[PDB]
Amino acid sequence: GPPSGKTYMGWWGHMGGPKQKGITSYAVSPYAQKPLQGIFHNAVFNSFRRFKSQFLYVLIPAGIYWYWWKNGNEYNEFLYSKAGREELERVNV
Amino acid sequence: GPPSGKTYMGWWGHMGGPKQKGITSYAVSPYAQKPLQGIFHNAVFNSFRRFKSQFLYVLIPAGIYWYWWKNGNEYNEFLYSKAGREELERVNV
Amino acid sequence: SLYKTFFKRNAVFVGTIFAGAFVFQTVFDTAITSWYENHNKGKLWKDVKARIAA
Amino acid sequence: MAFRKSNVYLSLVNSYIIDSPQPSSINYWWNMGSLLGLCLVIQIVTGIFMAMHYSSNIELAFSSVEHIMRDVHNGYILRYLHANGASFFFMVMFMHMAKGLYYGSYRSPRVTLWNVGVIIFILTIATAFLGYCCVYGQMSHWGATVITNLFSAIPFVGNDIVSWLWGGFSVSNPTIQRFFALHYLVPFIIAAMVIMHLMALHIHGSSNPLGITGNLDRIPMHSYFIFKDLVTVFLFMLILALFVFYSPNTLGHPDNYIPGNPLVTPASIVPEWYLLPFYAILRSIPDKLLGVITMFAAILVLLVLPFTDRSVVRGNTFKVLSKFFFFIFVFNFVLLGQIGACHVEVPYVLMGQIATFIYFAYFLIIVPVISTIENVLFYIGRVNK
Amino acid sequence: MAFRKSNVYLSLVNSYIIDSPQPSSINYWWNMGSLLGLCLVIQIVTGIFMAMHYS
Amino acid sequence: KVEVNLAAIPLGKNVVVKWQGKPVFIRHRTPHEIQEANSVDMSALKDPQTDADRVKDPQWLIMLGICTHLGCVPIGEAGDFGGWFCPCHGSHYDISGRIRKGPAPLNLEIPAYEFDGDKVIVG
Amino acid sequence: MTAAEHGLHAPAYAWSHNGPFETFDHASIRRGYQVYREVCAACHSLDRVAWRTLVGVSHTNEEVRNMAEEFEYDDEPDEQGNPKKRPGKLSDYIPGPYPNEQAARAANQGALPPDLSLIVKARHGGCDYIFSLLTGYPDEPPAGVALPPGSNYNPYFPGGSIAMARVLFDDMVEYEDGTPATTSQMAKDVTTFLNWCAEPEHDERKRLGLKTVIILSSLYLLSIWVKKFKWAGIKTRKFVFNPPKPRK
Amino acid sequence: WRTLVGVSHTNEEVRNMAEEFEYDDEPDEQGNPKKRPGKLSDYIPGPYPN
Amino acid sequence: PQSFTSIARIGDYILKSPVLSKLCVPVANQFINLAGYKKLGLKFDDLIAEENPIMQTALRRLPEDESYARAYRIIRAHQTELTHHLLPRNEWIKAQEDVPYLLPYILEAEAAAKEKDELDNIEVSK
Ligand SMILES: CCCCCCCCCCC(=O)OC[C@H](COP(=O)(O)OC[C@H](O)COP(=O)(O)OC[C@@H](COC(=O)CC)OC(=O)CCC)OC(=O)CCCCCCCC
Ligand SMILES: CCCCCCCCCCC(=O)OC[C@H](COP(=O)(O)OC[C@H](O)COP(=O)(O)OC[C@@H](COC(=O)CC)OC(=O)CCC)OC(=O)CCCCCCCC
Ligand SMILES: CCCCCCCCCCCCCCCCCC(=O)OC[C@H](COP(=O)(O)OCCN)OC(=O)CCCCCCCCCCCCC
Ligand code: HEM
Ligand code: HEM
Ligand code: HEM
Ligand code: HEM
Ligand SMILES: COc1c(O)c(C)c(C/C=C(/C)CC/C=C(\C)CC/C=C(\C)CC/C=C(\C)CC/C=C(\C)CCC=C(C)C)c(O)c1OC
Ligand SMILES: COc1c(O)c(C)c(C/C=C(/C)CC/C=C(\C)CC/C=C(\C)CC/C=C(\C)CC/C=C(\C)CCC=C(C)C)c(O)c1OC
Ligand SMILES: CCCCCCCCCCCCCCC(=O)OCCCOP(=O)(O)OC[C@@H](O)COP(=O)(O)OCCCOC(C)=O
Ligand SMILES: CCCCCCCCCCCCCCCCCC(=O)O[C@H](COC(=O)CCCCCC)COP(=O)(O)OCCN
Ligand code: FES
């Protein structure tokens, strides 16, 4: 077939990024490393840092929507009781 | 993706044939030609030439297989008649 | 001339093709049902129903 | 560039049916593969619309097909277009395969395309068999009886795979309910083998009736071969409409309008017309196990053809002897189908034993011997030592 | 070249699930799309085996 | 594996019950069976078999109809001996149930029905 | 096999519904239902035909309602749970004489009469075989054949021995319109009525087939012209060769 | 009835419980209806007909 | 896929035999005239299939004067069959011109590929 429209990604040898000069990388084999020394000092010390950074953006919305749900229940509980029969008659019509 | 294995056919601009030099072609528009002058003097004079060239390679096999089918029928017709009751008794067992 | 309006666009001609096919179905059906019923007249039910009305 | 070349989805359509390079000299025998794509669309569409009214229970199946033919609006059109559509699907495939066998389309570099085709042919015989049983007529009960009982001859696993196919101890209600569900699926597996089939054609393209290279003279697909394919589409519909509206029960059997009865056997149990050549090959061997092997071997013997052709020329256009023997094989295939619709009587037993030898001898003896002879005949006619 | 790169059918598998270039930093939220492919295979298989007994 | 009863099929009858999905040939008896079932020399046959090999619970008889042509069905209540009649190609399974002539190579199967008292299980 | 085991070949009569542009004769269908009600229905069922399908084909709506009302059907049980019966209506199906197959064989010496709603399509020969069967009983079998007790000779039946006996004799019905009711005449009507029971779409199938074939035959001829026009440049193309000079 | 064997009752116990009911058999040689006792493949019957 | 080395091995035994070359050569001359490639303007070596490495090697090494003339014969042939006609009787290939122009280039590509395989899977004398 023919070539198609060009993209923002290529393949191995020509990936389309900028040219690199002056960066050096080092590594070691897995067979030469001690087994999984990365589970602990990571499930307590690091996992707590990750929790403390982001828990405020979830729990303030959750607190708003759960408080709104309970006040709706308790009011519906009350309207269909014997004490809340007179208020049920008004807010319907 | 990457390139795949090379083939014996390409695309427009690079089709993989030999290089051409010294061949010239001419043509005329269809709008400038008279309507369909190619049906007659082609359905009688040409169609008979095409028939005569190739009909012998079909009809000698067809004659062999049709003759073999009729001699098989007529013999089966005969075995289950009143005249062919004695020959049917032998060729079974 | 004729070609500059008959089919110059093909909004001239896909609308004329479509609008002309709707009119074709009706005119085509009425002509076939009239030939079919007249070719077999005397055998249909409406002819039998008109011979037992005594 | 044009939008049809730069868009991810239109680029595939452009590369396959618009700008694809084609040889200029291909004839109308190259139009059968587009028809087989229309046949599959007809068969699938008409089946969805009948499946809304069908019931697969063995006490309801036969009367549900009559409910389609009497009560459903335009239901007799759906069925007859379906029953006659399958006979037209198989006739175009026999012509497609015989084409490739004549022009040498199986040879290198198109061996992979020929092997995926043999798989499609197996799945289409299976599909047609399973649906003929969903009618549950008299030929539909007793055809499933004698075919499923052939797998009883496999040693040490025979009586277990038959009770597993049936779901019990005979062709019964579990058998008909599972055959319908298998029957809806396999058409969608065929559609995926067709995609793989076209992908193997795109890398080398099509051949031509001269059997030489086509890279020197190519024309595009759009408005030359789109409008040449349109000629055979309207002839196909015209001939199919003639059978659906004026002769809709001439290619079937009358006994399938009787409901299935396990206690009453018919006087002659035969398949549809397109499985008769293979029914006569099975009937030729006087042994249960060897007849089942030979019946399946008659389909897989197509796979040794790329190896037994010993010619340096592709196709039969310029070959005198290999053209005479191509047509012996064609009319031998018609006599096999015709023997399979006869009684087991003298002389139809010997006629079917000789004709099934000529079927296997063509692929394994005749082709490699005359192809070697024709090579040497071309050499000595020119070279004068 | 390798056979998985020259064959018409294995070339697609290689380009998609073997040699496809991926960013190194993607997390476990990028694993939900492979699960949805397993879900569809579960449903189609179980439903076909039940359809043999349904009315 | 079914059990209708044992005093439910009188003498000169038979019922092709749909037992397990088959045309199977029930036959209630009297000692009026070893009378005449083997008054013929065995070796005038395809390749033979004896009463004691056939069934040794001998006063209730059952036999299949799954014929080795393509599944043909014999008679009820007629013939010269009183046997079972194939119109398919040709045969009459005599009172014992065997060849007189025909292209039929062998007799089928007497379903492996075992006796324990008060009910005979067919199958 | 032997010719007696296959049966005699039914000849080819000239039916007025044969041909691609012909309909049923609807006065023979009406005339043919009268022969079913008074001869055949004692021992044959028509279970796949509803009363409502006869309106506009052979009888008026008021005629058909009076024919269905002369039978009893099962209604839904009353307020205590006991069974009820009711008369017939248009949505009901034509009832048969026997309650079960055991009773049908008990009245015909072991033979079962089949349902006739599809007998024209389920036999090789079609209308030519049903007609020849009924008019084909000879008054004495040929010399030599030994019939079993309770069977009759008909050479159109495979084998030559059929459990049915002759049932058509001259002037056993009197037609309303006044046609002479001979043996051949009554046979021609039942075979025309029974083909309608198998093929109710026969008349409008062959009308929609005339439209389809005329439209597709015109599209097939227009396709040939368009293709030849668009291919005219390729067919008349010319080529010429001049060998290049040997210096490249 | 058969689903109770090996769960709550023995096989001999269950056969005697099913035999105390009447079910519809297939008709006789003339076409009249028949009744029969119960067996293990039968389903537990209810008190009301409709 | 019979090798050309083998075809010539058999053919040269027939031609150098007196009694064999008088029963099979007349038969082979009628076989070529009934085939009909000379009426389309083709020589036999144009019909050989070329989707393999031994034939791709022979065509690279063919001189260009003979290569340009081959491409014109193939284009002229596709066009003659497209129209369902034959060429004029004075444009047919004659028997003098029906020469094996490509055979010698093929036989030397085959003798070299066989020599390589015999060396790639040899066992040593020691
Ligand atoms: C149900 C589906 C229906 C379609 C299936 C058949 C279609 C494929 C058959 C191939 C064929 O076309 O037959 C030609 C065959 C071998 O010959 P060939 O390949 O060298 O030449 C081809 C050239 O392009 C014709 O076409 P041509 O270039 O000569 O002119 C165009 C032609 C259009 O006709 C058609 O539509 C043909 C489908 O113009 C007209 O006919 C105008 C009408 C007056 O010689 C024959 O005539 C043999 C006939 C076929 C017999 C085998 C099948 C029987 C079971
Ligand atoms: C009901 C049907 C569900 C069935 C499918 C279940 C799959 C749901 C997965 C949802 C998800 O994608 O959340 C991902 C998020 C982790 O984000 P991350 O890449 O930064 O953590 C990498 C990790 O540190 C390295 O962990 P590592 O690679 O070392 O081992 C992974 C292992 C856990 O290893 C441990 O022992 C503890 C470290 O297994 C897994 O973690 C399995 C994956 C859940 O998960 C988290 O831990 C935090 C987000 C909580 C999500 C809750 C809301 C969803 C309802
Ligand atoms: C396991 C599967 C096995 C499949 C085998 C199925 C066999 C039945 C298939 C029926 C179709 C077979 C027809 C042959 C098609 C192959 C292509 C072909 O034969 O066309 C080339 C042939 C040569 O004549 P041309 O003038 O067209 O020259 C062009 C190249 N030489 O041009 C021709 O077409 C020759 C002229 C027409 C011959 C018609 C004869 C009847 C063919 C059999 C039809 C069916 C039985 C009647
Ligand atoms: C390759 C596609 C198909 C082939 C070759 C095929 C073949 C057949 C055949 C030969 C029959 C018997 C025809 C007869 O004598 O009545 C049949 C029946 C049937 N098929 Fe198909 N079929 C295909 C696709 C489908 C599909 C996809 C469906 C469901 C969606 C379907 C639904 C049915 C039904 C409901 C019947 C029974 C009704 C009838 O007899 O026409 N078919 N099929
Ligand atoms: C549903 C079934 C099939 C479909 C839709 C299909 C489709 C196609 C199409 C569109 C083509 C290209 C045009 C043509 O050559 O006509 C083709 C070519 C081909 N097909 Fe099929 N095909 C099917 C079955 C088969 C079968 C059963 C075989 C062989 C057993 C087969 C073998 C081939 C071959 C060898 C070619 C190449 C011919 C050439 O280029 O000369 N196909 N197919
Ligand atoms: C994306 C795939 C599918 C989804 C999401 C899906 C969903 C469902 C759901 C929600 C039900 C009702 C479950 C219940 O409460 O019982 C159902 C029922 C059913 N589905 Fe599927 N389905 C899928 C594929 C299939 C397929 C391919 C079949 C093939 C026949 C199938 C066959 C059935 C059957 C027979 C039932 C009724 C039996 C039952 O209730 O489980 N399903 N489906
Ligand atoms: C009260 C009058 C009739 C009685 C007692 C009667 C009885 C029978 C019997 C016992 C059979 C079974 C034949 C066999 O198994 O050998 C039979 C078959 C048949 N009957 Fe009648 N019949 C009667 C009227 C008719 C009429 C008037 C017709 C035609 C319109 C007819 C059409 C047929 C046909 C077509 C068969 C099947 C023949 C075949 O399968 O080849 N019956 N009938
Ligand atoms: C050689 O040159 C060619 C060439 O000439 C051609 C023609 C093609 C194309 C050839 C084909 C055969 C096309 C392939 C066609 C298929 C694989 C068919 C598969 C698709 C279907 C069968 C359609 C399936 C239909 C549905 C899923 C919907 C049907 C159901 C409906 C509409 C009911 C919907 C419900 C309601 C309630 C309306 C080539 O690829 C090609 O190569 C370059
Ligand atoms: C980002 O990196 C990724 C990546 O991580 C992944 C996972 C994939 C692959 C992802 C997928 C989701 C795979 C695609 C999965 C599908 C398309 C599902 C298709 C499923 C089917 C077609 C169902 C097939 C099932 C059958 C045929 C059932 C068989 C049933 C039988 C045999 C029963 C027999 C009885 C009867 C009655 C039929 C990528 O493509 C990719 O991009 C590079
Ligand atoms: C895990 C491995 C796979 C993951 C994802 C693989 C994606 C598949 C294609 C992506 C690559 C496209 C780029 C070109 C290439 O190298 O691949 C060829 C693509 C396949 O081509 P094709 O669809 O057979 O065309 C065949 C042509 O005819 C165009 O196709 P058409 O007939 O329109 O099909 C529609 C019919 C039915 O399709 C359905 C319903 O699926
Ligand atoms: C959208 C639909 C899906 C499209 C396909 C994408 C998914 C890939 C399918 C799964 C991959 C499995 C393919 C098998 C790999 C080997 C193929 C091969 O060897 O090619 C062929 C042989 O294959 C065959 O015989 C038929 C293949 C059967 C296909 C099974 C369904 C070898 O051909 P080769 O490339 O070596 O060159 C020619 C040398 N004689
Ligand atoms: S069927 Fe038993 S012998 Fe012919």
Residue C4 sits in a domain of what CATH number?
1.20.5.260
Which SS3 state, helix, strand or coil, does residue D118 take? helix
Q: Which residue has the tokens 């798989």?
A: D119
Domain F1-123 has CATH 2.102.10.10: yes
Structure tokens at D191: 């559609």
Report the C-alpha gap between G102 and G99 in whole angstroms.
8
Residue type, E19: D
Which SS3 state, helix, strand or coil, does residue G165 take? coil
Are F78 and F85 within 8 A, CB to CB? yes
Substitution candidate for ligand 1 out of D25, D28, D96 with most atoms within 8 A of CB: D28
Measured over the CA atoms of residue I86, residue I91, residue I94 and residue I99, the dihedral's sign is negative
Give CA separation, G20 vs B2, C21, C42, D70, G210, in Å: 62, 27, 17, 21, 9
Which residues, in sequence order, are CB contacts of G205 under 8 Å at separation 6+? D76, D245
CA of G122 relative to ligand 7 center, distance in Å: 14
Bridge partners for H24 per DSSP: H35
Q: Residue I80: which of D151, F18, G237 has the closest Cα?
A: G237
Which SS3 state, helix, strand or coil, does residue B23 take? strand
F20 burial type by CB count under 10 A (0-12 exposed, 13-18 middle, 19+ buried): middle
Substitution candidate for ligand 1 out of G224, G228, G230 with most atoms within 8 A of CB: G224
Q: Which residue has the tokens 């868009």?
A: D7
Report the C-alpha gap between I48 and D382 in whole angstroms.
15
Which residues, in sequence order, are CB contacts of C38 under 8 Å at separation 6+? none
Are F26 and F45 within 8 A, CB to CB? no
- Within chain D, where are the H helices? 3-6, 10-13, 32-51, 61-70, 75-103, 111-133, 138-148, 158-166, 173-202, 226-246, 276-282, 288-300, 305-308, 321-339, 350-361, 367-382
Q: Which residue has the tokens 């796979």?
A: D303
Residues G104 and G222 in one domain: no
Ligand 11 contacts CB of residue D317 (under 6 A): no
Q: Which residue has the tokens 């002769």?
A: D247
Report the C-alpha gap between F42 and B20 in whole angstroms.
89
Give CA separation, G82 vs C7, D47, F48, H24, H45, in Å: 77, 44, 62, 18, 19
Q: Walk me through the domains of chain I, giving residue ranges and CATH numbers.
A: 1-126 (1.10.1090.10)
Are F23 and F65 within 8 A, CB to CB? yes
Which SS3 state, helix, strand or coil, does residue G145 take? coil
Are D172 and E52 within 8 A, CB to CB? no
Are F98 and F44 within 8 A, CB to CB? no
DSSP state string for chain E: --HHHHSTTHHHHIIIIIS----TT--GGGGHHHHHHHHHHHHHHHHHHHHTT--
Q: How was this structure determined?
A: cryo-EM
DSSP I36: -
DSSP D17: I
Domain count, chain G: 2
Structure tokens at H8: 């709550």
Sheet holding F24-28, edge to edge: F16-17, F24-28, F60-63
E20 to chain B nearest CA, in Å? 8
Report the C-alpha gap between G27 and C49 in whole angstroms.
9
CA of A37 relative to ligand 2 center, distance in Å: 19
**D136 — contact with chain F (CB < 8 Å)?**
no
Structure tokens at I86: 């034959």
DSSP state string for H10-30: -HHHHHHHHTTSEEEE---SS
Are F63 and F109 within 8 A, CB to CB? yes
Domain count, chain B: 1
Residues G57 and G94 in one domain: yes
Which residues, in sequence order, are CB contacts of A4 under 8 Å at separation 6+? D5, D6, D8, D11
Which SS3 state, helix, strand or coil, does residue D221 take? coil
Ligand 6 contacts CB of residue E50 (under 6 A): yes
Apex CA E37: angle with CA E35 and CA E43, to 5°?
A: 100
Report the C-alpha gap between I84 and B50 in whole angstroms.
9
Are F1 and F22 within 8 A, CB to CB? no
Are D47 and D82 within 8 A, CB to CB? yes
F60 burial type by CB count under 10 A (0-12 exposed, 13-18 middle, 19+ buried): middle
Q: Which residue has the tokens 């990028």?
A: E30
Residue type, D242: L
DSSP I110: H
Are I2 and I12 within 8 A, CB to CB? no
Catalytic residues of F: 89
Look up the domain containing C54 and give its range: 1-54
Between chain B and chain E, the number of residue pairs with CB atoms below 8 A apart is 14
Q: Which residue has the tokens 């290689």?
A: E14
Are I41 and D169 within 8 A, CB to CB? no
Q: CB atoms < 10 A from the CB of I89, how many?
A: 7
Q: CB atoms < 10 A from the CB of A45, how many?
A: 9
Q: Which residues of H touch G99 (CB under 8 A)?
A: 31
* D218, D223, D225, D228 alpha-carbon torsion, rounded to 10°: -140
Tell me which chains share at least 3 CB pairs under 8 Å with chain G: B, C, D, H, I
Give CA separation, B5 vs A10, D204, D371, in Å: 19, 11, 31
**G144 — contact with chain B (CB < 8 Å)?**
no
Structure tokens at E24: 């190194």
* G122, G126, G132, G134 alpha-carbon torsion, rounded to 10°: 50
Q: CB atoms < 10 A from the CB of G132, how many?
A: 20
| Residue D202 marked as a ligand binder | yes
Which SS3 state, helix, strand or coil, does residue I72 take? helix
Domain boundaries, chain F: 1-123
Report the C-alpha gap between E26 and E18 in whole angstroms.
17
Identify the CATH homologous superfamily for domain D3-382: Cytochrome Bc1 Complex; Chain C (1.20.810.10)
Can you give the CATH number for the domain in which A77 is found?
1.20.5.210
Q: CB atoms < 10 A from the CB of E45, how many?
A: 10
Q: Residue D311: which of I47, C10, H34 has the closest Cα?
A: I47
Domain count, chain C: 1
Residue set of the binding site of G: 40, 43-44, 164
Look up the domain containing G188 and give its range: 4-200
Nearest CA to ligand 6 atom 4: E43
Are G117 and G198 within 8 A, CB to CB? yes
Tell me which chains share at least 3 CB pairs under 8 Å with chain A: B, D, E
Which SS3 state, helix, strand or coil, does residue F28 take? strand
Best residue in G1, G2, G220 for a mutation probing chain D (most D CBs within 10 Å): G220
Quoted resolution (Å): 2.5
Structure tokens at B65: 């297989």
Are D78 and D49 within 8 A, CB to CB? yes
Q: Which residues of A touch E21 (CB under 8 A)?
A: 9, 11-12, 15
Best residue in E1, E17, E19 for a mutation probing chain B (most B CBs within 10 Å): E1
Are F15 and F9 within 8 A, CB to CB? yes
Domain boundaries, chain D: 3-382
Report the C-alpha gap between A49 and A51 in whole angstroms.
5
Residues G35 and G18 in one domain: yes
Q: CB atoms < 10 A from the CB of I67, how many?
A: 16
Residues G171 and G211 in one domain: no
**I120 — contact with chain G (CB < 8 Å)?**
no
Q: b/e for I32-61, b at 16 or more Cβ within 10 A?
A: beebebbbbbbbbbbbbbbbeebbebbeee
* Helix orientation angle between D75-103 and D61-70, rounded to the nearest 10 degrees: 100
Q: b/e for F89-114, b at 16 or more Cβ within 10 A?
A: eebbbbbbbbbbeebbeebeebbebe
* Helix orientation angle between A56-79 and A45-54, rounded to the nearest 10 degrees: 60
Are D209 and D26 within 8 A, CB to CB? yes
**What is the DSSP pairing of strand F120-121 with strand G72-75?**
unpaired
Using the 3D structure, point to which of G200, G215, G232 is the last residue of a domain: G200
Look up the domain containing A11 and give its range: 1-93
Report the C-alpha gap between G10 and G133 in whole angstroms.
9
Bridge partners for F27 per DSSP: F61
Which residues, in sequence order, are CB contacts of G236 under 8 Å at separation 6+? B27, B28, B33
Report the C-alpha gap between F47 and B41 in whole angstroms.
75
**I63 — contact with chain G (CB < 8 Å)?**
no
Nearest CA to ligand 9 atom 26: E45
What does the longest C-alpha to C-alpha distance in chain B come to?
A: 81
Q: Which residues of D touch B79 (CB under 8 A)?
A: 345-346
Q: Which residue has the tokens 């790329």?
A: D306
| Residue D73 marked as a ligand binder | no
CA of D271 relative to ligand 12 center, distance in Å: 22
Q: Phi and psi of G152, rounded to 5°?
A: -130, 155
Structure tokens at D61: 């199946």
Structure tokens at D195: 């995609």
Chain A, window 4-43: residues with a beta carbon less than 8 angstroms from a chain E beta carbon: 9, 11-12, 15
Report the C-alpha gap between F46 and F103 in whole angstroms.
9
What ranges make up the beta strands (E) of chain F? 16-17, 24-28, 60-63, 84-86, 91-93, 114-115, 120-121
Are D323 and B59 within 8 A, CB to CB? no
DSSP state string for D344-369: S-TTTTHHHHHHHHHHHHIIIIIHHH
